[PDB]
Amino acid sequence: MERKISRIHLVSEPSITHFLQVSWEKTLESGFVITLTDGHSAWTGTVSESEISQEADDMAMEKGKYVGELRKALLSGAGPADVYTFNFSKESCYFFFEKNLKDVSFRLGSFNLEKVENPAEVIRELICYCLDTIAENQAKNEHLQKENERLLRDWNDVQGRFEKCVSA
Amino acid sequence: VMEELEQGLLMQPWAWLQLAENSLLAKVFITKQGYALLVSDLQQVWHEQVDTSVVSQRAKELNKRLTAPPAAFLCHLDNLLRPLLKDAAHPSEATFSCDCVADALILRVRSELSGLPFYWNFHCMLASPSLVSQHLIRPLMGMSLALQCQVRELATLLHMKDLEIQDYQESGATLIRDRLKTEPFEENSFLEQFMIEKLPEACSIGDGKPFVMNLQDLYMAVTTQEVQ
Amino acid sequence: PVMEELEQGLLMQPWAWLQLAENSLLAKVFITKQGYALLVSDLQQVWHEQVDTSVVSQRAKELNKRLTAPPAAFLCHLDNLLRPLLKDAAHPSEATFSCDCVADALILRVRSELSGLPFYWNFHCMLASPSLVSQHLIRPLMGMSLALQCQVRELATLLHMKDLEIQDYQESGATLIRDRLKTEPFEENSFLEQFMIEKLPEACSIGDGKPFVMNLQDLYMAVTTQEVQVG
């Protein structure tokens, strides 16, 4: 159940940053659940394989390229020169994202999100997941540092032993 | 506005186009206010002049998700087309396909910009007799006349060089390299030899490639002179 | 088959200059006992016509009544009247020519005196099809241009060989006697640069088409024959 949290700036409200959480089971192709929050309200939607296939067919391109573009846009995997614009109509709860290219734009995708009666629960879940991953990464880094220190010490000792033996 | 497109198309050279094991000769002039295209296959000629409004109308229907102004679309199309027309054997990211329905040629170009698809179709109807004449017949006759004048100048220069060589031969010495001896140049004999030996290959238009590769500067100069 | 022979004959024939009452035209006519085929142009539009014995007889009866002639005799007389004019101009003709450019069609009226009696004919030439126009004007002209370019290249190579021979003569302990007979080295780029700015404006003027018929007809005929033989 892979998850990814990214920060975006909607054109409608550029003075604040929204958080987009995308969760998928195995791969983005199969489907994913997205959640857009701003600290006070949350909107959750789901996209299935059928919707992705229909969008790819409508845009008339291979599924792989569309999946790659979706990964670059939603998961914040953009390259050195790649601008993506996210629009969200709150009154209609319609969230779409497009790729900006000079003076032209491509409507990369669109979904119809729905409000959740308890944004607090999802906010707390997101914060708890962030804290858990932070702790896990810190523990892994500490273990790796310990291993590196041990390896360095052993390497130095073996180097000294070799220095003695070469002259012996 | 409209006249500028016609003048630009007239002042443009022919380019070779390859598509689905087929060849075409294309002249394209694209500006922010529209474009003009003329495509020939040595048997028929099709022409298309297009303005910004129709560009937007066709683009919004071909690329549903593309939100672009006519100027940007035209600039992108020009940047995509000019490199291919200028020369071949380059990173051609565009695929071309031509089809005839009843009397008009539909030329579809499909490419990718920033990895996203981009389509454009030229619906070029048969060119009018005046346009075809002005673009092919008169320039070709002018080029032929200019080449004949060049041949006459070359013959005169050869005659002068032969006179100098004869001066040396009659009053002078012998060449150290006997292999360099050259026969006197006779216009009638040279023309006869050319006609019976190399005319069949020289006059082989083929699919239009030799016309583009060999003489295009002369065509441009003749067209410019005709304009003035 | 008769139509095919007429088409082949028209293709073989060379262009000729015709001087009407006010204007001028480039024309190619091929007449046989089975009918005729004509192609006229004015460097802006091309008109074509092709008629068979029946059409010829109907037109002869409707235009010049009181004349009872078979179509073969009428075609032979038309050939006798037209061919001398096309072969050479500015000679005793006594055959008035006129043109009327009706909407999307042309009418070429020819009037003559046949043994001292009136003889009228009209060519109803409609706009020529793109295929015929291309085959008759465009491809032959491109072939002629390519052949002339090849001739220019050959002459340049000959000039280069002559320059090499002159250099050998000069280097072989020689001394030119007549200094005036001194040809400078030949450079293709310099010659082209001089030509394009000195003679192209006057050498690329087609005018009314007279230079085309007066200069580039043998090459045109050869190119057309080669194209026919190829296919």
From Swiss-Prot, chain A:
Entry's localization field: Nucleus; Chromosome
GO CC term (a single one): nonhomologous end joining complex
Keywords assigned by UniProt, alphabetized: Chromosome, Coiled coil, Cytoplasm, Disease variant, DNA damage, DNA recombination, DNA repair, DNA-binding, Dwarfism, Isopeptide bond, Nucleus, Phosphoprotein, Ubl conjugation
Coiled coil (residue ranges): 131-165
Tissue: Widely expressed.
Post-translational modification: Phosphorylations by PRKDC at the C-terminus of XRCC4 and NHEJ1/XLF are highly redundant and regulate ability of the XRCC4-NHEJ1/XLF subcomplex to bridge DNA. Phosphorylation by PRKDC does not prevent interaction with NHEJ1/XLF but disrupts ability to bridge DNA and promotes detachment from DNA.
UniProt GO MF annotations: DNA binding; enzyme binding; FHA domain binding; identical protein binding
Signal peptide: none
Keyword Cytoplasm listed: yes
GO biological process, any: cellular response to lithium ion
Main localization category: nucleus
Region of interest (Interaction with IFFO1), residue spans: 1-168
Result of altering K102E: Abolished interaction with NHEJ1/XLF
Outcome when changing K99E: Abolished interaction with NHEJ1/XLF. Abolished ability to bridge DNA. Abolished ability to bridge DNA
Organism superkingdom: Eukaryota
Phosphoserine sites (modified residues): S53
Protein family membership: Belongs to the XRCC4-XLF family. XRCC4 subfamily.
Disease / disorder: Short stature, microcephaly, and endocrine dysfunction: A disease characterized by short stature and microcephaly apparent at birth, progressive postnatal growth failure, and endocrine dysfunction. In affected adults endocrine features include hypergonadotropic hypogonadism, multinodular goiter, and diabetes mellitus. Variable features observed in some patients are progressive ataxia, and lymphopenia or borderline leukopenia.
Protein name: DNA repair protein XRCC4
Organism: Homo sapiens (Human)
UniProtKB/Swiss-Prot annotation, chain C:
Record's keyword annotation contains Coiled coil: yes
Gene that encodes it: NHEJ1
Compartments, record wording: Nucleus; Chromosome
Name of the protein in its database record: Non-homologous end-joining factor 1
Annotated consequence of substituting L141A: Does not affect ability to participate in V(D)J recombination
Record annotation: effect of changing E187A: Does not affect ability to repair double-strand breaks (DSBs). Does not affect interaction with XRCC4
Effect of Y120 to A/D: Does not affect ability to participate in V(D)J recombination
Disease with which this protein is associated in UniProt: Immunodeficiency 124, severe combined: A form of severe combined immunodeficiency (SCID), a genetically and clinically heterogeneous group of rare congenital disorders characterized by impairment of both humoral and cell-mediated immunity, leukopenia and low or absent antibody levels. Patients with SCID present in infancy with recurrent, persistent infections by opportunistic organisms. The common characteristic of all types of SCID is absence of T-cell-mediated cellular immunity due to a defect in T- cell development. Microphthalmia/coloboma 13: A form of colobomatous microphthalmia, a disorder of eye formation, ranging from small size of a single eye to complete bilateral absence of ocular tissues. Ocular abnormalities like coloboma, opacities of the cornea and lens, scaring of the retina and choroid, and other abnormalities may also be present. Ocular colobomas are a set of malformations resulting from abnormal morphogenesis of the optic cup and stalk, and the fusion of the fetal fissure (optic fissure).
Result of changing R66G: Does not affect ability to participate in V(D)J recombination
GO cellular component terms listed in the entry, alphabetical order: DNA ligase IV complex; DNA-dependent protein kinase-DNA ligase 4 complex; fibrillar center; nonhomologous end joining complex; nucleoplasm; nucleus; site of double-strand break
Quaternary structure (record): Homodimer; mainly exists as a homodimer when not associated with XRCC4. Interacts with XRCC4; the interaction is direct and is mediated via a head-to-head interaction between N-terminal head regions. Component of the core long-range non-homologous end joining (NHEJ) complex (also named DNA-PK complex) composed of PRKDC, LIG4, XRCC4, XRCC6/Ku70, XRCC5/Ku86 and NHEJ1/XLF. Additional component of the NHEJ complex includes PAXX.
Keywords: Chromosomal rearrangement, Chromosome, Coiled coil, Disease variant, DNA damage, DNA repair, DNA-binding, Nucleus, Phosphoprotein, SCID
Renumbered residue ranges of the record's region Globular head: 3-137
Outcome reported for the amino acid change (mutating L137A): Does not affect ability to participate in V(D)J recombination
Phenotypic consequence of R59G: In IMD124; likely pathogenic; fails to translocate to the nucleus; decreased ability to repair double-strand breaks (DSBs); impaired ability to participate in V(D)J recombination
Result for mutant: L63E: Does not affect ability to participate in V(D)J recombination
Expression sites (tissue/organ): Ubiquitously expressed.
Single GO MF descriptor: DNA polymerase binding
The species this protein was found in: Homo sapiens (Human)
Residue stretches in coiled coil: 130-172
Portion of the full sequence shown: 1 to 229 of 299
